[PDB]
Design a protein around this nucleic acid. Structure first.
Ligand SMILES: [Mg+2]
Length: 137
RNA sequence: CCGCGGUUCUAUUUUGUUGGUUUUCGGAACUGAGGCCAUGAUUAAGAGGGACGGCCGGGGGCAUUCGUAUUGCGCCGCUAGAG
């Protein structure tokens, strides 16, 4: 039982943590090495009820802590990391939830593998939304 | 330019007795073979055109090739949120 494999004590098991930390949301999604099988997915939206702090560091770190206890529960010690922003033709830098989810996951008893950016980078995308005069504010 | 060949008519004579005048009479008509001309073309625009040589360029047109992205769809996984 214990919802895990028969791995030895010294040997560590690697998951893959896709962090789609965009603006207005912070996806934390731990899958296996293939990516076709997920272990746990917690988001700042499901950790807060204010609807404006869904990309906030507080909600992102709550999601990171919650997914950490699930990974330890199911028997995962190490974790590769694939950070991802909105991508496409829209913004390319990750939102505010990427950093707090990163620190909270590490400080909640987890190991870190290799960190890579997997933001979708078009060669040349379709026309962006907003018009030629942009978002007048 | 300088002469020499080569063709049609015409001012005029007086070969004053008329008639006949040669009138080539003088010159002007078309032309063949020459000599000579120092024989005859200014230079080649830091003007232009063109040719020639090697390169150069998101120049143009046609065909071909690749890229991830966006959107949608088909199977798989866990979740109540996603935007
Ligand atoms: Mg303004």
């Amino acid at each position: 039982i214990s919802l895990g494999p028969q791995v030895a004590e010294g040997e560590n098991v690697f998951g893959v943590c896709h962090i789609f930390a965009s603006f207005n949301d912070t996806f934390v999604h731990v899958t296996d090495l293939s990516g076709k099988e997920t272990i746990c997915r917690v988001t700042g939206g499901m950790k807060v009820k204010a609807d404006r702090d869904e990309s906030s560091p507080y909600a992102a770190m709550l999601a990171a802590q919650d997914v950490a206890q699930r990974c330890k529960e199911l028997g995962i010690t190490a974790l590769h990391i694939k950070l991802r922003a909105t991508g496409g033709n829209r913004t390319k830098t990750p939102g505010p939830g990427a950093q707090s989810a990163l620190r909270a996951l590490a400080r909640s008893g987890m190991k870190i593998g290799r960190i890579e950016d997997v933001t979708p980078i078009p060669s040349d995308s379709t026309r962006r939304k907003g018009g030629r005069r942009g978002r007048r504010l």
